[PDB]
Each structure stands twice: as structure tokens, then as C-alpha cells.
Design a binder for this molecule. Structure first.
Ligand SMILES: *[C@]1(C(=O)O)O[C@@H]([C@H](O)[C@H](O)CO)[C@H](O)[C@@H](O)[C@H]1F
Length: 634
């Protein structure tokens, strides 16, 4: 429940202990051979032909067993498939194996990078040296042919080539041991380069990721200078707005995401967007899982698709495969694409000719099949959401804001546009007694003791207010960016005087006590009480009951400011977080929500709460101050 959507369906395409593969004997005779388990799915489109790539783990599902690379391919979008063994293992031993295919499509060619092992019984990261290993590159060519109106295809697979001679003996003076591809679909960059994210094991047994790329269609390969932190594995890469985005598996902690604007030379952790959003299980202390990570264009908008199990059962069970869609600002949970509480695993997603598919593992008793899934209901919802995103951004960007003294007398006589770049969430008119709906359909705020008003809520009662969850999102922390930077905006009225001080808007911190990163309170003397981290919150300024004010909280570079009516309150611009440890914001609070502790009852009305993943600039703050009556969804 939350599960493969109505409209969608699947088949067991690579059927454990059932589907055969054309195993080639040493003498060249072909034998249709049953396969215990099919693992490590990738599905891609090569010039109209679906190509599904998988480990055929012939005898057992163990990693260090007899494995070859299987392919199934279809010219009729999966009505029918032909089956190959694309890549043979060395046949050196009973555990000879080509493993963990990583695939790039360029034109009618598939570039497949696999690890190849002869006799080791333990895993690649654990080997004493690289002697049992070769990284093999194989090129497949897809040829389509039509005759009597019947399209068919063949795929020819080149002889494997070892890239072992190209593997540096060290990086930063520490010796390398082995590398393999990051698993799954990799890319051709807009400059034509073949870009593989790779996993490197050093002679110390540590692992990290790097980009290995080719400028000449695989004739030569270069390892770019940058790398992940140690502990990152199975990286997936896409290209977004001129950067590589490298999304890493991280066993036992949250997933690190890096960006590189220079073909891997320099990596910067994506603290302001996607890093640490996703994780391996609710508690983050479990073995992680491979994920697909693909850029697609849906309804005219470029988005990234990401698949990962929730792994509520933990370990390698990997139940509850989800698909997320993000425009690098908003992050939408498309839903669970596996069925019920079944164990899934590694996955792949493909958008081809305006249809969405997945190829993913299902696991019963550690026997694995690959299901081929028609994500029909999922695509419908995705298109709806992208339309919402487009419609709202367009709407906001089209508002004619008031001219200001240095407006360049422009078109329509408007001031600067309402900012939409980095606009992550927006709470406005749509709400009920318990939910304040994110206009962008990703993260609702939870509400208590509220009454609806145009564009927001009026709070009256114990814990009257809204909680916009940050760390409180739980496993997938879509607002993790806020720990690095944010702007939070709202229009407010104070409806009744507080007894002493009462909360209005801010960012709470995880931990005991009642700590806030940045926020605003108000008091019985009709002063504001901005809260700048742990600093004693000194009253300042003046407000009137019933009057609408504009509130902006900005935090970036560990500095916090609080603006009322487009002007900073005393005490703004200083450091609100100390250390080089990111804050852990629990939630944004709007009004005085609480479920425990003091029975706060902030009698305020808040409308049009906007959240950005960056610090708005002075022009943008002014624009919002001047356009408060223009942005609401009522
Ligand atoms: C995958 C898995 O099922 O967890 O794990 C990797 C590997 O064991 C981990 O990345 C730890 O190094 C295997 O290579 C992969 O085939 C698959 F089993």
C-alpha cells in the first residue's frame, strides 16, 4: 500500500529459475541454460530498441558466483524480446564472473563496462590486490531493419577490452586496487563525452567514486581529478544545467550527491539541493542500494528521476521501491512502484517515446527476478505535477510587480519579477483543518487549531500553527537544503496581544530545549523578538495589532537575517550557527505549533508562506514586499 499505480502493470521479464539464456560452451555450441537469479537491471533505449541488461547469476544469487551479462532487447516496446549473453566471463573457475554492468548509449552503440573476476570468492573491495580483476569495456551495435513492414533488430557485441592498463597506480599518492562502473545507466555529456561514474577501491580497502570519461568514443579514457568522500559507492551520474550530478550509494549513512561543472575535475557537494536527501532506510544505518538517476524531459520540463527502496525491513530486503521526480528545487515522491511489501532491489527507469518503464529486482528467498514495469499511472501523475510546477512558476513570473525608483521603465510598466528560481514550496490558499497544501505538491505543512482565511490560516488555540517538516520529513529529507541555506517568507497579522512573548515564524532545531536556528517572535510590548541562533533574543522595533507585515528570514553562509516590511531587524546579519557541523532543522514553524511543553497559543494569521533554497537578494526581498497582494492562490 502506496504501490504500483492503477493503470500500471508489469511482467516478470527475466524470470528466476525459468528464463533461459544462450549459454555458449567452450566449443562454441549454444545451450539454453536456466538461470538461478537475474540481478543488476538496466534498461535503455538504443535508437528505438529497448535493451535490458542484467547479471545472469546462473547458479546462485551470491555476488561471487558464476555470472555472465545477459541482454534482452525489444523493437516493439516490450511486446516481444530476443535474449543474448552479451558478455561472457573468463571461464577460469566455477566463480568466474562479469558483473555490475554500467551502460552508455551513444547513437546505435552501447558501451558496457563490467568488472571481470576469475576465481575470488570474496568481494572486490576486500581483495588483497587487483590481480583477479579486469575492468572490461564491451561495445554493442544495434542494427534495425524493416522488411515486409516488420521491424527487427540485431545486436552485435564486440570483443571485450580491458581498461586495466589505463588505471592509475595511485590517486593522491595512495595506491589503487580495482575499479568498476557505478552500475546502471550512465551518459553521454552534451559535449559528446562518454561519462562513466566509477567506484574505486584502494589498497587500504576504502572506496570512493570518480568520473572516468572519454572524448573520442571510448578510444581513450581519462580519470577526472575529483572524487567523493570515502564510503561512497555505486555512483549514478546525469548532466543537469551544465554540471554532472553524481548521486552516490552510501552504506550506513545518508546518500551524498556532488556536482561538477568541469567534467569531474572539481566536485562540490550539493548541500543546497540533493545531498543527504535520500538514504538507505528510515534509521540510515543500513546497507544502501543502487539507484537509477536519469534526466528526462516531461511536459516540456527537464527533470531528474531517482529510484530507491525505502528498505523498511532493512538489510538487503529493499522493500518499497519509490520513484522521485525533481527539478533540482522541488522533490516529488511519485510513489511506490513495487507492489505491496515485496522485496525489490536494484532498479532502472526509462522514458521512451512518451512512455515510462522500470526494470527492477524482486527478491523472494534471495532468488531474484527482474520485472518490466509499465509506469502508466505514475507518468500521469508526473505530468500533472510538472504542469502544476510550470503553471505556478509561470503565473508568479508573470505578475506585474510595482515599479521601483530604479526600474528600467520596462514592459508593462512592471518592477522585477516575483522570484521563482529556487522557489521550493509555497503555502497559500488551499488548506484544511489539518493540512496546508504545498502549492508545488511536494511537502505539505501540518496544521492545528486553525481557521482558513484567504491565502492562509488564522491560529487560535493551544498549538495553533503549522509545522513545515524538515528533518521531521523522516527518511527522505527533501528540505535538507535548509541546513545550508534558505529564505522563508510570509505575510502575517498579529490578531491578539501575547501574554509575554509568542512565536511567529522560524526554523526549529532538532534536540532538547527549544532551540531555534532563526526565527521571529513578538511580545506584549508590541515589539519584535528576532531569534538569531542561540543569541539572547532582544526585543526591537514596533508593530500594531491587526496590521499586515511582511516577514523574510534568510540564512546562508551561517548568517541569519530577519526582515519586517523589507527592512532588517536589529541584530540581523550575524552568525547563527557555530561549528562546521551542519544544523539539523527539525521544521519550519508558522505561528506557535507544539505537541508538548508550554501550551503556546499564538494568535496570528499567516498567509503566503514561501520557501526558497537560497538567500534571496535585496531586489528579490523588495519585490516580494511590494507584491504581497499579488502572489496568493486565492
Ligand atoms: C549490490 C547489492 O546487492 O548490494 O552490492 C554490490 C556490492 O556488494 C556493494 O556495493 C558493496 O561493495 C555488488 O557488487 C552488486 O552486484 C550487488 F550485489
Amino acid at each position: 500500500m502506496a504501490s504500483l499505480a492503477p493503470g500500471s502493470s508489469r511482467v516478470e521479464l527475466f524470470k528466476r529459475k525459468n528464463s533461459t539464456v544462450p549459454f555458449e560452451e567452450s566449443n562454441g555450441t549454444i545451450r539454453e541454460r536456466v538461470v538461478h537469479s537475474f540481478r543488476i537491471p538496466t534498461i535503455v533505449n538504443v535508437d528505438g530498441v529497448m535493451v535490458a541488461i542484467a547479471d545472469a547469476r546462473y547458479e546462485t544469487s551470491f555476488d561471487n558466483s558464476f555470472i555472465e551479462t545477459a541482454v534482452k532487447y525489444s523493437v516493439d516496446d516490450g511486446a516481444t524480446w530476443n535474449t543474448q549473453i552479451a558478455i561472457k566471463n573468463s571461464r577460469a573457475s566455477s566463480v568466474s564472473r562479469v558483473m555490475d554492468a554500467t551502460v552508455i548509449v551513444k547513437g546505435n552503440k552501447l558501451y558496457i563496462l563490467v568488472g571481470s573476476f576469475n576465481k575470488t570468492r570474496n568481494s572486490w573491495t576486500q581483495h588483497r590486490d587487483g590481480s583477479d580483476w579486469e575492468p572490461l569495456l564491451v561495445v554493442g551495435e544495434v542494427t534495425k531493419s524493416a522488411a515486409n513492414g516488420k521491424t527487427t533488430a540485431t545486436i552485435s557485441w564486440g570483443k571485450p577490452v580491458s581498461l586495466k592498463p589505463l588505471f592509475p597506480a595511485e590517486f593522491d599518492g595512495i595506491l589503487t586496487k580495482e575499479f568498476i562502473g557505478g552500475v546502471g545507466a550512465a551518459i553521454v555529456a552534451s559535449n559528446g563525452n562518454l561519462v562513466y561514474p566509477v567506484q574505486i577501491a584502494d589498497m587500504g580497502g576504502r572506496v570512493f567514486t570518480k568520473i572516468m570519461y572519454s572524448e573520442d568514443d571510448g578510444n581513450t579514457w581519462k580519470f577526472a581529478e575529483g572524487r567523493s568522500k570515502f564510503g561512497c559507492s555505486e555512483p549514478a551520474v546525469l548532466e543537469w544545467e551544465g554540471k554532472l550530478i553524481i548521486n552516490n550509494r552510501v552504506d550506513g549513512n545518508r546518500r551524498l550527491v556532488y556536482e561538477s561543472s568541469d567534467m569531474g575535475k572539481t566536485w562540490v557537494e550539493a548541500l543546497g539541493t540533493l545531498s543527504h536527501v535520500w538514504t538507505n532506510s528510515p534509521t540510515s544505518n543500513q546497507q544502501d542500494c543502487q539507484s537509477s538517476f536519469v534526466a528526462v524531459t516531461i511536459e516540456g520540463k527537464r527533470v531528474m528521476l531517482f529510484t530507491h527502496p525505502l528498505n523498511l525491513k532493512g538489510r538487503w530486503m529493499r522493500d518499497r521501491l519509490h520513484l522521485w521526480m525533481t527539478d533540482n528545487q522541488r522533490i516529488f515522491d511519485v510513489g511506490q512502484i513495487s507492489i505491496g511489501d515485496e522485496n525489490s532491489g536494484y532498479s532502472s527507469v526509462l522514458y521512451k517515446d512518451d512512455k515510462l518503464y522500470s526494470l527492477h529486482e524482486i527478491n523472494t528467498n534471495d532468488v531474484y527476478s527482474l520485472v518490466f514495469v509499465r509506469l502508466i499511472g505514475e507518468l500521469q501523475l508526473m505530468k500533472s505535477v510538472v504542469r502544476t510546477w510550470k503553471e505556478e512558476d509561470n503565473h508568479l513570473a508573470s505578475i506585474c510587480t510595482p515599479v521601483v525608483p530604479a526600474t528600467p521603465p520596462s514592459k508593462g510598466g512592471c518592477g522585477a519579477a516575483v522570484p521563482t528560481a529556487g522557489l521550493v514550496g509555497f503555502l497559500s490558499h488551499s488548506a484544511n483543518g489539518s493540512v496546508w497544501e504545498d502549492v508545488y505538491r511536494c511537502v505539505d505543512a501540518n496544521v492545528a487549531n486553525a481557521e482558513r482565511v484567504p491565502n492562509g490560516l488564522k491560529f487560535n488555540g493551544v498549538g495553533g500553527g503549522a509545522v513545515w517538516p524538515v528533518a521531521r520529513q523522516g527518511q527522505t529529507r527533501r528540505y535538507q537544503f535548509a541546513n545550508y541555506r534558505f529564505t522563508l517568507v510570509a505575510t502575517v497579522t498579529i490578531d491578539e496581544l501575547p501574554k509575554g512573548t509568542s512565536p511567529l515564524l522560524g526554523a526549529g532545531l532538532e534536540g532538547p530545549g527549544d532551540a531555534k536556528l532563526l526565527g521571529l517572535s513578538y511580545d506584549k510590548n508590541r515589539q519584535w523578538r528576532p531569534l538569531y541562533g542561540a543569541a539572547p533574543a532582544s526585543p526591537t522595533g514596533s508593530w500594531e495589532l491587526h496590521k499586515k507585515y511582511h516577514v523574510v528570514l534568510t540564512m546562508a553562509d551561517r548568517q541569519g537575517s530577519v526582515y519586517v516590511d523589507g527592512q532588517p531587524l536589529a541584530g540581523s546579519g550575524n552568525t547563527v550557527v557555530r561549528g562546521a557541523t551542519l544544523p539539523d532543522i527539525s521544521h519550519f514553524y508558522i505561528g506557535g505549533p507544539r505537541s508538548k511543553g508550554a501550551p503556546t497559543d499564538s494568535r496570528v494569521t499567516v498567509t503566503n508562506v514561501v520557501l526558497y533554497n537560497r538567500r534571496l537578494n535585496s531586489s528579490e526581498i523588495r519585490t516580494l514586499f511590494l507584491s504581497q497582494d499579488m502572489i496568493g492562490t486565492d
